[PDB]
């Protein structure tokens, strides 16, 4: 319910973390405006902090939500799997 997601684009896997064979599970919360624009994006928790946070924020800046609907307190979970794949809850 609320703002519907058009472009839930997956953040990019880190070339440093892949070489460390790390998997990043990030829990991020964001808000969207009445135009459906993602803002107030904060990574609440992650496997390695700044290792994945950086690429998450990059993705969140491109997330597109249907205009006409603002959202407040939207938390999702991004699963960066060791194979270099990405999924958002």
């Amino acid at each position: 319910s609320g703002p519907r997601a058009l472009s839930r684009n997956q953040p990019q896997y880190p070339a440093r973390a892949q070489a460390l064979r790390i998997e990043g599970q990030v829990k991020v919360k964001f808000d969207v405006t009445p135009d459906g624009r993602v803002d107030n994006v904060q990574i609440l928790s992650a496997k390695p902090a700044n290792m994945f946070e950086r690429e998450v924020k990059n993705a969140m800046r491109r997330w597109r939500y249907e205009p006409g609907k603002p959202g407040s307190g939207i938390v999702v979970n991004i699963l960066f799997k060791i194979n270099g794949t990405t999924e958002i809850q």
Side-chain angles (χ1 to χ4, degrees):
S1 308
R4 180 181 175 241
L6 298 315
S7 182
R8 254 185 178 212
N9 183 90
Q10 335 280 90
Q12 187 176 270
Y13 212 81
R16 186 192 298 156
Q18 65 180 211
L20 265 304
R21 280 311 190 197
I22 308 174
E23 315 176 69
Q25 56 183 151
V26 317
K27 179 181 294 297
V28 199
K29 190 172 67 175
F30 58 100
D31 296 318
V32 318
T33 45
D35 190 82
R37 308 204 182 177
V38 187
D39 185 45
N40 295 333
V41 178
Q42 299 184 269
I43 286 78
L44 315 170
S45 302
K47 268 289 184 173
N50 283 204
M51 288 286 296
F52 279 79
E53 260 187 85
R54 182 186 56 211
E55 268 53 273
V56 182
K57 294 186 181 68
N58 270 272
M60 304 290 292
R61 295 178 73 189
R62 293 202 56 233
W63 281 27
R64 229 297 172 210
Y65 278 73
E66 287 188 14
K69 298 287 186 174
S72 303
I74 330 184
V75 58
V76 308
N77 199 99
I78 318 178
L79 300 314
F80 300 86
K81 293 294 89 197
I82 184 176
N83 182 86
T85 61
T86 51
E87 168 171 58
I88 287 100
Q89 291 194 29

